Scaffold this active site. Structure first.
Site, PDB file in Angstrom:
ATOM      1  N   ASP A 191     -15.825  -1.414 -13.529  1.00 50.48           N
ATOM      2  CA  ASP A 191     -14.963  -2.185 -13.947  1.00 50.48           C
ATOM      3  C   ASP A 191     -15.142  -3.618 -13.361  1.00 50.48           C
ATOM      4  OD1 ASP A 191     -13.512  -0.373 -15.635  1.00 50.48           O
ATOM      5  OD2 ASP A 191     -13.695   0.969 -13.264  1.00 50.48           O
ATOM      6  N   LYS A 212     -17.247  -7.205 -17.018  1.00 48.24           N
ATOM      7  CA  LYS A 212     -18.209  -7.772 -17.965  1.00 48.24           C
ATOM      8  C   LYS A 212     -17.981  -8.179 -19.398  1.00 48.24           C
ATOM      9  CE  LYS A 212     -20.392  -3.981 -16.128  1.00 48.24           C
ATOM     10  NZ  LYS A 212     -19.450  -3.168 -16.617  1.00 48.24           N
ATOM     11  N   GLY A 264     -15.412   1.048 -21.186  1.00 48.90           N
ATOM     12  CA  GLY A 264     -13.606   0.511 -21.421  1.00 48.90           C
ATOM     13  C   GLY A 264     -13.657  -0.970 -21.704  1.00 48.90           C
ATOM     14  N   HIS A 265     -14.559  -1.921 -22.076  1.00 47.78           N
ATOM     15  CA  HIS A 265     -14.415  -3.025 -21.860  1.00 47.78           C
ATOM     16  C   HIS A 265     -13.669  -3.710 -22.853  1.00 47.78           C
ATOM     17  CE1 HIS A 265     -18.650  -1.239 -21.002  1.00 47.78           C
ATOM     18  NE2 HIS A 265     -19.163  -2.890 -21.333  1.00 47.78           N
ATOM     19  N   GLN A 322     -22.656  -0.067 -18.065  1.00 40.29           N
ATOM     20  CA  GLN A 322     -21.764  -0.711 -15.881  1.00 40.29           C
ATOM     21  C   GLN A 322     -22.629  -1.340 -14.952  1.00 40.29           C
ATOM     22  OE1 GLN A 322     -19.701   4.184 -16.158  1.00 40.29           O
ATOM     23  NE2 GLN A 322     -22.046   4.356 -16.772  1.00 40.29           N
TER      24      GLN A 322
HETATM   25  N1  GDP Z   1      -6.430 -10.158 -12.838  1.00 41.31           N
HETATM   26  C1  GDP Z   1      -7.833 -10.709 -14.058  1.00 41.31           C
HETATM   27  N2  GDP Z   1      -7.938  -9.440 -14.267  1.00 41.31           N
HETATM   28  C2  GDP Z   1      -9.232  -9.271 -14.992  1.00 41.31           C
HETATM   29  C3  GDP Z   1      -9.908 -10.335 -14.905  1.00 41.31           C
HETATM   30  N3  GDP Z   1     -11.197 -10.353 -15.226  1.00 41.31           N
HETATM   31  C4  GDP Z   1     -10.756  -9.702 -16.030  1.00 41.31           C
HETATM   32  N4  GDP Z   1      -9.376  -9.061 -16.104  1.00 41.31           N
HETATM   33  C5  GDP Z   1      -9.348  -7.526 -16.279  1.00 41.31           C
HETATM   34  O1  GDP Z   1     -10.244  -5.937 -15.464  1.00 41.31           O
HETATM   35  C6  GDP Z   1     -10.575  -5.699 -16.854  1.00 41.31           C
HETATM   36  C7  GDP Z   1     -11.999  -5.597 -16.263  1.00 41.31           C
HETATM   37  O2  GDP Z   1     -12.856  -4.564 -16.798  1.00 41.31           O
HETATM   38  P1  GDP Z   1     -13.031  -3.631 -18.106  1.00 41.31           P
HETATM   39  O3  GDP Z   1     -13.013  -5.005 -19.215  1.00 41.31           O
HETATM   40  O4  GDP Z   1     -12.490  -2.758 -18.522  1.00 41.31           O
HETATM   41  O5  GDP Z   1     -14.218  -3.432 -18.337  1.00 41.31           O
HETATM   42  P2  GDP Z   1     -15.676  -4.114 -17.458  1.00 41.31           P
HETATM   43  O6  GDP Z   1     -16.547  -4.398 -19.232  1.00 41.31           O
HETATM   44  O7  GDP Z   1     -16.506  -3.156 -16.927  1.00 41.31           O
HETATM   45  O8  GDP Z   1     -15.579  -5.271 -17.196  1.00 41.31           O
HETATM   46  C8  GDP Z   1     -10.805  -7.086 -17.559  1.00 41.31           C
HETATM   47  O9  GDP Z   1     -10.995  -6.150 -19.621  1.00 41.31           O
HETATM   48  C9  GDP Z   1      -9.155  -7.271 -17.936  1.00 41.31           C
HETATM   49  O10 GDP Z   1      -8.267  -7.142 -18.287  1.00 41.31           O
HETATM   50  C10 GDP Z   1      -9.932 -11.467 -13.653  1.00 41.31           C
HETATM   51  O11 GDP Z   1     -10.861 -12.951 -13.376  1.00 41.31           O
HETATM   52  N5  GDP Z   1      -8.545 -11.628 -13.500  1.00 41.31           N
END
Ligand code: GDP
Ligand code: GDP
Lengths: 429, 429
Positions: B17, B20, B44-45, B228
């Site tokens: 997670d 990306k 789960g982007h 991933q």
């Molecule tokens: N606090 C914080 N949350 C973040 C940041 N970047 C991303 N996120 C949150 O955490 C998630 C990161 O993983 P996710 O999107 O679920 O899937 P990924 O495609 O594997 O990145 C994002 O969608 C945001 O809601 C950041 O710089 N700070």
């Protein structure tokens, strides 16, 4: 030859028997490391030393003949220990000392004896579309890998949990095929057997990913040996008539732990014509005189079975495809001498549908591949023995033109021209 | 940002997670094409548009929010049609028009409803240690692909043979698991169902390999989207606690038909610390209040389950590993803002065995990975809110140093720094 990149590779463009072994063996003279990335024992890389001794490698990289070369068996490979050792045994008895020269990755998966019995149990269930794999078990091996219950090489260092892992794999195999003779006695059988293998393989086991990378930063030359050809790729091939590995340039990365930016020049081994061992789509297949002829001149018969292999003309469409998939820097046009008795040579220049509409690029749909027809181009064949020609310009003009024609159509130049099974039989261009 | 190579890519460095989705969404502004290459619906982007709407993509590439972007689902993917349409439905109802923008590869495999039921039957059958998967059936999907009996997207254009293929897959599933309720009626069920899916999906189906390659020579910009993280790679991950695909750089090649030499700059998305959703090896795991605080500030809980995720310090050993595997050009240090409340920040700098011998690089042996201990480094944290900082130099000095330290230990420069889940919350360097 010495102008190759620090990290070069050799891959197959057609359906498997292009003649990479010969090339790797010839190229290994200027490479510190020779590493295989995909596939398994299914291979059969034939080579002849300076004298003429016939060496048929399977798992051990073809560069094993060069004493000052470290051979590496990557993580993408599926090693069958019983066979691996048998290959090493008969390799040292024939001269080549494999001590400390065969590095076996601890992340590579173990192809077990049950994997071979299981693969065959599914063959007796197949219809008219049965695979050509004679109970090798490549499919089941990678099946377990993906399922994540397969056993790896490094797992041999924990003999306490090994029997536990074994039980599951055997349980999966027994639950699936009723014909699978599974007994609590056979479980203890391979446990004791693989224990001996574990002790024996121990010196061989090494961190391939680390090694390769460390070696690369140490400026050591690495030559990756392509398992098979791209048209047999699990993705870009003629599915389902392909192998379970990735003979493509991508498999070098996934099978060794090398970044795409680290992979250098890739040489695509292209046969002067084409062959295919099992059943499936073959656009340029010849089922007549020219076919039976190419087979004899090229000795295109199974080494273990003697079964006649399907033969056809150099498929340009299928070749441009493999060229874009792998992005080859150079090509190794093998078996040019096979066309020495040909009056006129043909090329599979294009594809066209039943209705007439031209086919864009090599299609994935098996049906369209069995419906369409090829548009040939006929080139004048030279009718003179050339298995003794060392220089390029010494080649018959008709021959030069054929080579030059493949380059014009494909876009990728040919720097290597094989004109005989010999180690010395190679024309540089 | 506009300096990026023609064929860039974004991959994960830890266990899933990183963040990306956010990045791809941000980078998509200057890219003609965005394409996924591996994995399935397991993703789960999460992304937030200009207003603040929460979009949670799965199969559709994260660059779908940019209207002038053509999303491509590569051949390495395992599409579950029922889910894909449901996603496209709730996506268009939320504004984004997916008509003629989502290109689904014909060489991609179809994740069937039985694949999901089968996957779950293997976890309940297993004793003790499980996997932790939501029962999406990613493993079984690739299993069939490897076994070569799996049905592809392009096989939907031949409805006459489709029911034949179905029978085999279902037969395999029924023969294996006794719990699998298989009836001749359920066969006809998915046959008629997938016929509807075939007619609907028809416009989407396109030759991914050809499209991508043709587009590339046409000088079109392509941003590959990493499924991933590499520590979840089937080969380079923490087997057996990884996914069935290849989140590595290699997966870009095997999942799209792109030559390694064609793949441009790869951006590694690294979290300011580390997480791990399921169970398995986690060297830097913090079972104390340090992990508690780290989890809360990061909101590390399952979106569908709300389950607490394992938290720890940024693993440098694991990070250097992923950096050499994928050969990243730049990095995107995400979730920096999570460490804003921390008095002191730690870094997993080195691994050392129980006896003391240093563990060279990241090991494949799960046991060794659960026996070794980590040697940390402690940096002073800044204790200020930074979620509004836009320029780099505007960041507290302690923060800058943290960033620069990761670059020093790793060797790859960080050009993107995330300080909030927002679309605009990114600092360029
Ligand atoms: N606090 C914080 N949350 C973040 C940041 N970047 C991303 N996120 C949150 O955490 C998630 C990161 O993983 P996710 O999107 O679920 O899937 P990924 O495609 O594997 O990145 C994002 O969608 C945001 O809601 C950041 O710089 N700070
Ligand atoms: N006649 C002939 N045989 C060749 C030539 N180049 C290679 N061979 C032989 O053709 C066979 C093909 O090699 P093989 O090991 O089957 O292919 P691999 O799939 O790359 O391992 C070997 O016996 C080679 O020595 C050539 O130019 N002419």
């Amino acid at each position: 030859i010495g102008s190759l990149s620090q990290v070069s590779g050799v891959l197959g463009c057609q359906w498997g028997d292009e003649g990479k072994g010969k090339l790797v063996d010839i190229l290994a003279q200027h490479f510190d490391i020779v590493a295989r990335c995909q596939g398994g024992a299914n291979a059969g890389h034939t080579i002849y030393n300076s004298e003429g001794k016939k060496f048929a490698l399977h798992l051990v990289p073809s560069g094993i003949l060069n004493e000052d070369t470290t051979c590496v068996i990557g993580n993408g490979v599926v090693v069958h220990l019983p066979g691996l050792f048998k290959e090493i045994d008969g390799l040292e008895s024939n001269g080549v000392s494999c001590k400390g020269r065969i590095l076996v990755s601890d992340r590579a998966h173990l192809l077990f004896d049950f994997h071979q019995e299981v693969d065959g149990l599914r063959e007796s269930e197949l219809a008219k579309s049965f695979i050509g794999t004679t109970k090798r078990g490549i499919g089941p091996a990678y099946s377990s890998k993906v399922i994540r219950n397969g056993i790896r090489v490094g797992d041999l260092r924990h003999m306490d949990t090994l029997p536990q892992k074994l039980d599951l794999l055997l349980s999966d195999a027994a639950a699936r095929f009723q014909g699978f003779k599974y007994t609590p006695e056979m479980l203890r059988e391979e446990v004791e057997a693989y224990k001996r293998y574990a002790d024996r393989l121990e010196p061989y086991i090494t961190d391939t990913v680390h090694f390769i990378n460390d070696s690369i930063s140490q400026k050591k030359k690495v030559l990756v040996e392509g398992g098979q050809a791209t048209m047999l790729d699990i993705d870009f091939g003629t599915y389902p008539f392909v192998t379970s590995s990735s003979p493509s340039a991508g498999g070098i990365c996934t099978g060794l732990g090398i970044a795409p930016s680290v992979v250098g020049d890739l040489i695509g081994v292209v046969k002067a014509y084409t062959t295919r061992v099992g059943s499936g789509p073959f656009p340029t297949e010849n089922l007549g005189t020219g076919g039976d002829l190419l087979r004899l001149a090229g000795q295109e018969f199974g080494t273990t079975t003697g079964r006649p292999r399907r033969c056809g003309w150099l498929d340009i469409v299928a070749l441009k495809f493999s060229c874009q998939i792998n992005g080859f820097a150079s090509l190794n046009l093998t078996k040019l001498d096979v066309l020495s008795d040909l009056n006129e040579i043909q090329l599979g220049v294009a594809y066209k549908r039943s209705d007439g509409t031209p086919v864009k690029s090599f299609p994935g749909d098996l049906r369209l591949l069995e419906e369409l027809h090829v548009e040939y181009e006929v080139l004048p064949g030279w009718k003179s023995d050339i298995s003794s020609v060392r220089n390029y310009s010494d080649l018959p003009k008709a021959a030069q033109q054929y080579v030059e024609r493949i380059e014009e159509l494909v876009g990728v130049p040919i720097h290597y021209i094989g004109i005989g099974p010999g180690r010395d039989a190679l024309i540089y261009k």
